[PDB]
Design a protein around this ligand. Structure first.
Ligand code: MG
Ligand code: MG
Ligand code: MG
Ligand code: MG
Ligand code: NA
Ligand code: NA
Ligand code: NA
Ligand code: NA
Lengths: 1016, 205, 206
């Protein structure tokens, strides 16, 4: 009793000791269910031996473990509440979640943690059947506890356990009694294991995964591994099943392994226990290896996820079943040959993405519905691989990836980003036991899943000897999967794959000890033969993914560039509520959390509620599995599939003058893997009317699949066909001049030019005004996250684009009128103006404009702009005004329908687009410049029409308000409609969000610019 | 504070039957150090005044199992303890027999548990510390080799635990020592989970 | 040599192939390397003795190669030519006669050198068992050592007898071996394999 008390148990401070990572914890193993019926195991029915303890628990929060009273161990405290398990206790208001990127959330003094260590006390009162306690073994399984815990059953201390992302199991057979039982779990927020868990994510705690009880017989299956081997052409396979038992060996014990393909048995084997001779001392008596021959096996791949069911039976010679386990088996071979990563003898192209386990409401608690939604969206957007972001995932995730067909990179829960010099722990032999536990337990748990093709040793922990040791351990235990690791320069001896983070396509980044070469250069460095797969690239912070097409051109051109994983899938934003109870999305610092990294927690391609960002369509287009070539008038279609024929594919084509369609047709796709099909279009129409002809093709899946609905569009492409230049030709407007204004009349329209300012100040139709703000030049945009580019909240950068623009005075430049002159032509009125934008006597830009109002009511605007060569290149060159009208729809002829930028427009298609005004605004959580549409020839707002070749955005929010507002929920619509029309716009970048990344050719670096606009 | 230093609490967590716990509060390994305060002495490898040998006469008592040790041993020397020279193997003094086995383990094979009849040697030394040592700096005790696992007490307070028998174990004693007379108590166990990795063809002592 | 030997396990690698024992083995290796890495006389690290071959051995071999690349690492485990050794280091391999055992054959050292794909040097970690009146055939080993460049010698087993002193009723000392102390199952006189007596008096074989 005295040794079960809190005073004794807490005295040794096991959570401040890297040498003690657990106490009385059972060995790791693949998932078990302990079926007592072979049919139930084969069909994967729920097992009566596996009981879920998820539900209602009693919870009490304490500021430190010492504050817990001794009465909690025997009876529930009066102040304990009832909460749902699994859950994070930060999502119930007990203490704040903390978002920190690199800096540790506690003072750096390993292995010690602060004395103010928040503590969560969970207790559950439950009942156990007498048959469970009569025989066999009863264990409790904690799928995940953050970050360390002590366990009591009926007042007796059981065990400890540390690692937060892997299951902990304890034997409860000696502690349970018939009838009512009570479990007490003390969960600590910080421990010495927290030093290895410095990932860029919200820091939470609690029992955040499932809790269950498993009953097994005394003679039991303790472990089983499956392995598949093949011949040269994969016509013959051998299934290798090694089974280990626990308990007492008896001569009558047998093991049967049967392989089932859906409903028919394809192979089976039976043997007594006792393995082959291992060494001078003999072999394993408690192990048996079963070999099964499979003829013409169906192979597993992301394209076609063929699965078998393997059932392992422990039974007597007379035929009495003792216990059965089962797993899904996929026949596939992953290996690196001659510098290429091959799956089933074919080189892979990885269309991957990094995915954190995050839910905006439940925090880091994962459920099947959210996982399935994520997988469906990823497959619908042409992703075929996922990287478990820096920790092992929920066990069901791998089963779902097996079933739906995604390749998986499984990562050990090790990240020491906050150390200086970042390998302080991973080069220290005293931390080798803890790291080894984190690696070996993950490999033991997950080695049977076919979807897992690559092991990863962790993330951002430098390079230490511990990494080399664990790499060699994995290569010894599981040689069927390559091992990768990025830390310490991405090409060290602890990785089979060069896996850089945010390496650029063509530009080198020479950091002193760990340079980031361009990937093309990296491939050919002397002595380098490994394949290159980027573990993180195209940082998707906010309005981003500029330059993605360059990465994918490089991927397709170079054989040893086998793709990469985008960072990342989903924003890590949390939901808060205002005084009215209206929810809004929150990021770092919104909970009063200790030093934070603000909006750097939102880097996703989809919103926290799984609503797509515009960049997702660019990703889908660049990753598509069909590539198109047009050589008039033949479309050549090339399949990038490695294994599957195009049997669910239909090619639609269409030719339009403006859209305004002219012709269309449908051709079924019949192309072999990596094959080619020539499609001959019928005689295309040749209209005599002026305009550009466009050919658009789309590949449509007519039949539904497990992951998509009938009619799903999987790939598309567009081309220009033939242009007919317009060669045709088209009352006198009255000019009235006063010392304050130039005022022009034509019938029922009036234009007013303010002679003091030199801008068009008002326009009339009838008696109603059209402008709330004059038409003026604009050279700035509300800064994107890529423009701000300051990774740590405290590390200011003078090289960021926003800092250069601020220092040069681009946001404060004042326009000085240089000329304002009006002339009356024979059939038109000519207005000439000139302005100079200056900051402390330095002329930044000069604008010269001519306004020509003709007898047809149209106003033709010509703009010429000179930019000083020594000022930073401006974000945009264009015009800006606030219109009085608020219309419901926006109709334009240009690129669309989604938001697109000069850096990010390969997925948009030229056509006639119509959308509600609300669809013209992209609600990024951190407000910024958004909603641009490039390549626009005509724009129709309510009464107005603009024609030319320009980029535009149109919304209810001015650029100033977007600049000054930190959350999208604090934006308020303005009185009218703000319109920005740009002749030219800078790229958005996106190679990373902490350094300038807009290529030189998408910068506005030309000295002079010209554009033309007609307003009718 | 006293209840957690007692034999009942310390021995309740059978650290010698646990492969996960190979030490407690042991310092990091390092090349041999002498802490010379003069460069000439270090160069000529003279004896250093900062490195003091505790070899000599200790008090020893043999027990058949760790549970048989009385609680009074932690505060004062037992009346039945003898005086023996250290370093030494207690099999060479007749307390129990040495065992020569080539391959077969000297205990029943069931890793990591060891037999309950686990012979136990209780060493105690009463010594004196200069005040200048306790005024500043750090004082550590170095056990070059202990077979096969041991718990350490200084002045009745539990210090640490160590297993590997052929490598030095070092513990920080700065917070445990007092001016004048001090007493160390060392409980040495013959068998531990580390014995499973020490099956060499030699006399087991 | 690290203080690791699990000769008595069945199979010999039951502990060394188990990840749960990796922390203890790692301590035994890393602490020895940390203590002794500055000594010039130490030219080779050894991972232990007679513990089979497990993944823990491969891990610790790679750790040593990472931390101290200035010394080769050897290990006689499951077959003496595994991936955890830089030197083929068989135990009691004979000069000209093969000893085919299942899964761990003891080839003759001359044959061992030329097996397909084998390029490492061969140094016997134990040879010429010097039990009592022994060391017959020693000259054959040394002829082989001098003839073959890649046969770089070996370590004789062993230096000194492990006999203990007991006393009779007259108080006259006498040398004792296994079983003379009433010890639980013992291996009799196999503790005396030395070239010299326990008091360092030479045997004729020296
Ligand atoms: Mg710990
Ligand atoms: Mg990081
Ligand atoms: Mg232990
Ligand atoms: Mg031996
Ligand atoms: Na490629
Ligand atoms: Na981030
Ligand atoms: Na030679
Ligand atoms: Na011997």
């Amino acid at each position: 009793m005295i040794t079960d008390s809190l005073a004794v148990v807490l005295q040794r401070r096991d959570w401040e000791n890297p040498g003690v990572t657990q106490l009385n914890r059972l060995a790791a193993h693949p998932p078990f269910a302990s079926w007592r019926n072979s049919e139930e195991a084969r069909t994967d029915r729920p097992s009566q031996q596996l009981r879920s303890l998820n539900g209602e628990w009693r919870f009490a929060w304490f500021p430190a473990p010492e504050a817990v009273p001794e009465s909690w161990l025997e009876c529930d405290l009066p102040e304990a509440d009832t909460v749902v398990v699994p859950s994070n206790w930060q999502m119930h208001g007990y203490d704040a979640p903390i978002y920190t990127n690199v800096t540790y959330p506690i003072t750096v003094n390993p292995p010690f943690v602060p004395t103010e260590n928040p503590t969560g006390c969970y207790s559950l009162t439950f009942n156990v059947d007498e048959s469970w306690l009569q025989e066999g073994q009863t264990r409790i399984i904690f799928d995940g506890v953050n970050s360390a815990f002590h366990l009591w059953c009926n007042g007796r201390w059981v065990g400890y356990g540390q690692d937060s992302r892997l299951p902990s199991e304890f034997d409860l057979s000696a502690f349970l009694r018939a009838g009512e039982n009570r479990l007490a779990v003390m969960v600590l927020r910080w421990s010495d294991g927290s030093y290895l868990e410095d990932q860029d994510m919200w820091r939470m705690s609690g029992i955040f995964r499932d809790v269950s009880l498993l009953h097994k017989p005394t003679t039991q299956i303790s472990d089983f591994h499956v392995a598949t081997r093949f011949n040269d052409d994969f016509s013959r396979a051998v299934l290798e099943a090694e089974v280990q038992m626990c308990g007492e060996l008896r001569d009558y014990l047998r093991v049967t392994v049967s392989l089932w393909q859906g409903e028919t048995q394809v192979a089976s084997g039976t043997a007594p226990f006792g393995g082959e001779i291992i060494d001078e001392r003999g072999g394993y008596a408690d192990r048996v290896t079963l070999r099964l021959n499979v003829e013409n096996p169906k192979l597993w791949s992301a394209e076609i996820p063929n699965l078998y069911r393997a059932v392992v039976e422990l039974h007597t010679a007379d035929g009495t079943l003792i216990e059965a386990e089962a797993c899904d088996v996929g026949f596939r071979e992953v290996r690196i040959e001659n510098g290429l990563l091959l799956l089933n003898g074919k080189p892979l192209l990885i269309r991957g993405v990094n995915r954190h386990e995050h839910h905006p409401l439940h925090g880091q608690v994962m459920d099947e519905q959210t996982m399935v939604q994520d997988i469906l969206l990823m497959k619908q957007n042409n992703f075929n691989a996922v990287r478990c972001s820096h920790y092992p995932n929920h066990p069901l995730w791998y089963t779902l990836c097996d079933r739906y067909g995604l390749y998986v990179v499984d990562e050990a829960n090790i990240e020491t980003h906050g150390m200086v010099p970042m390998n302080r722990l991973t080069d220290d032999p005293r931390w080798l036991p803890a790291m080894s536990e984190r690696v070996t337990r993950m490999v033991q748990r997950d080695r049977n899943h076919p979807s897992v093709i690559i092991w990863s040793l962790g993330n951002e922990s430098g390079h230490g000897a511990n990494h080399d040791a664990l790499y060699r351990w994995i290569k010894s235990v599981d040689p069927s999967r390559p091992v990768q690791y990025e830390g310490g320069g991405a090409d060290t001896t602890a990785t089979d794959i060069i896996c850089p983070m945010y390496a650029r396509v063509d530009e080198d980044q020479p950091f002193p000890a760990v340079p980031k070469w361009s990937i093309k250069k990296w491939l050919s460095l002397p002595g380098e033969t490994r394949p290159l797969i980027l573990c993180e690239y195209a940082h998707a912070m906010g309005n981003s993914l500029g330059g993605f097409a360059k990465y994918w051109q490089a991927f397709r051109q170079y054989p040893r560039l086998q793709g990469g994983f985008v960072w990342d899938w989903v924003d890590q934003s949390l939901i808060k509520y205002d005084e009215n109870g209206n929810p809004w999305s929150a990021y770092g610092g919104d909970f009063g959390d200790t030093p934070n990294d603000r909006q750097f927690c939102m880097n996703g391609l989809v919103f926290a509620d799984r609503t797509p960002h515009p960049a997702l369509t660019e990703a889908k287009h660049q990753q598509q599995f069909f590539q198109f070539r047009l050589s008039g008038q033949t479309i050549e279609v090339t399949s990038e599939y490695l294994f599957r024929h195009s049997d669910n594919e239909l090619l639609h084509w269409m030719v339009a003058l403006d859209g305004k369609p002219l012709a269309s047709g449908e051709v079924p796709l019949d192309v072999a893997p990596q094959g080619k099909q020539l499609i001959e279009l019928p005689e295309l129409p040749q209209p005599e009317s002026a305009g550009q002809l466009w050919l658009t093709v789309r590949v449509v899946q007519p039949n539904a699949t497990a992951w998509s609905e009938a009619g799903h569009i999987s790939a598309w492409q567009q081309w220009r066909l033939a242009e007919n230049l317009s060669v045709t030709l088209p009352a006198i407007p009255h000019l009235t001049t006063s010392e304050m204004d130039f005022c022009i009349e034509l019938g029922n329209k009036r234009w007013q030019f303010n002679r003091q300012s030199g801008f068009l100040s008002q326009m009339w139709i009838g008696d109603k005004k059209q402008l709330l703000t004059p038409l003026r030049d604009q050279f700035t945009r509300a800064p994107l996250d890529n423009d701000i580019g300051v990774s740590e909240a405290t590390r200011i950068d003078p090289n960021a684009w926003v800092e250069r623009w601020k220092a040069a005075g681009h946001y404060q430049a004042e326009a000085a009128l240089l000329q304002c002159t009006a002339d009356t032509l024979a059939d038109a009125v000519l207005i000439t103006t000139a302005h100079a934008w200056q900051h402390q006597g330095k002329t930044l830009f000069i604008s010269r404009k001519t306004y020509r109002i003709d007898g047809s009511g149209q106003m033709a605007i010509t703009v010429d702009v000179e930019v000083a060569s020594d000022t930073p290149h401006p974000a945009r060159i264009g015009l800006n005004c606030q219109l009085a009208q608020v219309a419901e729809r926006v109709n334009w002829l240009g690129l669309g329908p989604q938001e697109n930028y000069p850096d990010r427009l390969t997925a948009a298609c030229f056509d006639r687009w119509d959308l509600p005004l609300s669809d013209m605004y992209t609600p990024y959580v951190f407000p910024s410049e958004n909603g641009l549409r490039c390549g626009t020839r005509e724009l129709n707002y309510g009464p107005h029409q603009w024609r030319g070749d320009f980029q535009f955005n149109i919304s209810r929010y001015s650029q100033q308000q977007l600049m000054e507002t930190s959350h999208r929920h604090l934006l308020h619509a303005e009185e009218g409609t703000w319109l920005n029309i740009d002749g030219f716009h800078m790229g958005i970048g996106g190679d990373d969000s902490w350094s300038p990344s807009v290529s030189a050719e998408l910068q506005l670096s030309a000295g002079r610019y010209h554009y033309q606009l007609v307003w009718c | 504070t006293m209840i957690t230093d007692s034999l009942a609490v310390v021995l309740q967590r059978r650290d010698w039957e646990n492969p996960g716990v190979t030490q407690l509060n042991r310092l990091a390994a390092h090349p041999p150090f002498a802490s010379w305060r003069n460069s000439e002495e270090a160069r000529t490898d003279r004896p250093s005044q900062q490195l003091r040998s505790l070899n000599g006469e200790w008090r020893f008592a043999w027990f058949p199992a760790p549970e048989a040790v009385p609680e009074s041993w932690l505060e004062c020397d037992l009346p039945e303890a003898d005086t023996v020279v250290v370093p030494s193997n207690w099999q060479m003094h007749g307390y129990d027999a040495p065992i020569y086995t080539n391959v077969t383990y000297p205990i029943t094979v069931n890793p990591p548990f060891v037999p309950t009849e686990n012979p136990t040697g209780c060493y105690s030394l009463t010594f004196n510390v200069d005040e200048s040592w306790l005024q500043e700096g750090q004082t550590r005790i170095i056990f070059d080799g202990v077979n096969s696992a041991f718990h350490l007490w200084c002045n009745g307070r539990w210090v640490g635990y160590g297993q590997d028998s052929r490598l030095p174990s070092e513990f920080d004693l700065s917070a445990f020592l007092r001016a004048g007379e001090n007493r160390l108590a060392v409980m040495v166990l013959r068998w531990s989970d580390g014995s499973y990795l020490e099956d060499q063809d030699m006399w087991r002592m």
